[PDB]
Each structure stands twice: as structure tokens, then as C-alpha cells.
Amino acid sequence: NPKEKIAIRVAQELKKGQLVNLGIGLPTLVANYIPKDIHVFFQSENGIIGMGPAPKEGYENSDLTNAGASYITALPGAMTFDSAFSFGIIRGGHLDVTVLGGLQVDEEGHLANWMIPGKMIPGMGGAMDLVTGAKKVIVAMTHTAKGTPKIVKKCTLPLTSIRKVDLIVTELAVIEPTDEGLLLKEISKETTLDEVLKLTEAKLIIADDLKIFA
């Protein structure tokens, strides 16, 4: 449900004909909630444009996977390619959207999502190229980590890059980083403005227009 609420709301930000890259984990659920009427094309960093859902049993191909090595399908008109071409797409501004998961976001729009010192050290993979290169970065993340806020004044965990992400989506809030600060645009209807502010360390501008729907 919390991951659902986030995934549904991210899925409404996607537009017809967009090339979209989804991070593994929470963002991949976005692909379950694309509206009919919206056709998008999915990129995976290991080298495909035209990724499709997991194969029906017995239709697997060991050479065809996502960026977690799980079996996927290729849709008609798919292209596969080497890792140089793949990051030419990502770093060269040809990717319209990337949805990525989040460890922290700060008031400059700065994302940390690839390392917790002491705890988890998996390496960055393609996450740095994706944030610095995508036309639009949407972070999809739960609002707190066991009550600790993830939206903070200055990122304390190592940065994925200095680019300002274009939108944050949590189960309680929709936040757009701007020229002068995080702009709260939307609130979930199971929550209240008061709770969102108790659960955010970072300063938020509040919009005159302030909408509901996660």
C-alpha cells in the first residue's frame, strides 16, 4: 500500500511516447499502473530499448534480462545494444524520464541513493549517469526510514550527483524542487499537512494550489 500509493502517483507523471528508465525495487512497480491511453518505452541499462514484462513460464531467454538479471520480454520494435550505446542514451539526454529510489533528498534537490557508510556498499552501478543525464528525474521513496525523515536540509549520505531532481514522490507528499526551495505540491488524503511537516526536516514552501491524491 505505501509502495502502491507511490507507484500509482508516479505513473500519472508519464506521457505518451516517453523513453523511461525504472530503477529496480520500488520504481519497477510503476509499470503496473501505467494508464491505458499512455504508451511508453522502457530502457534497461544492461542494454535494451523496448523492455517488456516478465515472460510467461517457458518463454524465458537466458540472454534477455533486466538490470537485476531477472528474465524479461522484448516488445516489437525493441533494440538491444552495447553498454557504451546504452549510456550514450542515458548521459546524452535521450532518456525522457528516470524513476529512481531514494535514501535522502535535500533542499537543493540533491539525491543520495547508492551507499550507506558502515552498512551497505553495493556500488553506484548506473545511478550516477542516470541522475546526471535524464531529462527528468523522479525520486520514488517512502517518506521516513523508521520515522527518521529522508527529506532533509543537507544530504548526510554520499551524493549520487549534484543535479537537482525534478520531483519527489512519497506516500504522503509530492514535492518539486525549485530555484528557491522544495515546493510542496500535493498531499496524500490519508495524511494531513501537519504530519507532513512534522515528518520533514527540510524546509518546504507550500503551494497556494495544494492538491490531494498521494
Partner: protein
């Protein structure tokens, strides 16, 4: 004469070699070539690859057997044993952003001295890298990665050694084939010259030195 028995690995892969190994989490990796390396316990390798795959697959098998002193990769988080050797100091782990790794290997293959990339600017990656401003934007200077031997996987080779790849098994393989001094390709099938079109081949046979199975 490109096709050789897998035993020839031992003349070709020396102890302490610097190796490029193709494969994305073990998809499009030369598993048979890796198994021969483990059989003869060829060690103190420096391995350049996207990742250390998984504990029982592909490049992770070389790590399981402690055959690497160093890995230059972008991701190690599917392999706990890579992380355990990293934490103890036995294994030197250099982390490179995947896209920068692709361009650092390609720079070696195509004869560039380096590439300027905006990835990693302002992060831990910027450590110990020259920074260059072009038209008022900052880039990290990233430098070519060379290797003694590339161990790549492909779907088919023709009699002349031209290679084609299959779907997401392509990833780093054709890039590494250009970058190393010697190139050893593990392939699933040998097909007649003329089966692979000039418009379809991705790696010319002229750059492939040896082929296994």
C-alpha cells in the same frame, strides 16, 4: 587457427594478468573460460568488469576462489563475498560509474587519451581526478583502461572470427574486444562465412585472437 582448445587458456592468461571480462550480472559472460581459470588456480588477477555477478556465477566464481587481488567494477552488491573480501582488505575494490567504465574502456579501444564526463562531478568519484571546465561546465577527466587479455562471450563466430551477440548479453563484450592486447572469445556456435552479414557483425574477426568452443 583462431579456434583452440580450452587448455590454451593457460598459455594465454598469466598470473597477475589484468583482464577484461564481459558480462552483466553474469549474462553474456564466458563461463567456460572462467572455469578453466579456476581449474588451474590462475590468481592475483586484476579484473575489469561491470560487476562481480553472484557468488556462484560468472565472475563471482573467480572471487569465491580468491583469484583476484583487485576488481574495477561498477557494482558488487549482488555478491556478499566480494563485499566481505573488500572489508577485510584482501580485495581492492575500485568503483567506477557504469557509464564512465564503458567510456574508459572504449577510450582504450579507440585510441583516445581520456574522455570528459559530467557523471560523478561533485561526488566521491571526483577524488583524485583532474576537473576541466568547458563552456562554463565542469567535467571529470576519466582515463583509458587497458588490459592484457579480454575474455568475452558471443553467440556466433563465422570461420573468419566475426562475432554477433544476442540481446542483453552484448553489454560490455564488444567494447572490451577493442581495448585489450589479446582477445579470447567464447562462442556458442561456429557458422560459415557468409552467414553473418556485413551489416550485422558487431566485432570483426581481425580483432579476435582466439576462440573457445
Amino acid at each position: 587457427m583462431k579456434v583452440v582448445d580450452i587448455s590454451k587458456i593457460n598459455e594465454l592468461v598469466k598470473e597477475g594478468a589484468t583482464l577484461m571480462i564481459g558480462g552483466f550480472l553474469g549474462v553474456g559472460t564466458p563461463e567456460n573460460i572462467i572455469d578453466e581459470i579456476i581449474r588451474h588456480n590462475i590468481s592475483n588477477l586484476t579484473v575489469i568488469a561491470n560487476d562481480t555477478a553472484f557468488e556462484d556465477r560468472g565472475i563471482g566464481k573467480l572471487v569465491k576462489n580468491k583469484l583476484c587481488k583487485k576488481v574495477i567494477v561498477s557494482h558488487i552488491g549482488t555478491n556478499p563475498e566480494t563485499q566481505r573480501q573488500m572489508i577485510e582488505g584482501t580485495l581492492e575494490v575500485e568503483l567506477v560509474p557504469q557509464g564512465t567504465l564503458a567510456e574508459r574502456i572504449r577510450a582504450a579501444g579507440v585510441g583516445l587519451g581520456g574522455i570528459l564526463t559530467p557523471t560523478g562531478v561533485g561526488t566521491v568519484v571526483e577524488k583524485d581526478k583532474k576537473v576541466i571546465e568547458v563552456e562554463g561546465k565542469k567535467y571529470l577527466l576519466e582515463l583509458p583502461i587497458h588490459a592484457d587479455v579480454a575474455l568475452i562471450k558471443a553467440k556466433k563466430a563465422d570461420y573468419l572470427g566475426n562475432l554477433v551477440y544476442n540481446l542483453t548479453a552484448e553489454n560490455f563484450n564488444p567494447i572490451m574486444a577493442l581495448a585489450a592486447k589479446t582477445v579470447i572469445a567464447e562462442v556458442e556456435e561456429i557458422v560459415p562465412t557468409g552467414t553473418l552479414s556485413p551489416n550485422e557483425i558487431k566485432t570483426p574477426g581481425i580483432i579476435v585472437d582466439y576462440i573457445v568452443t
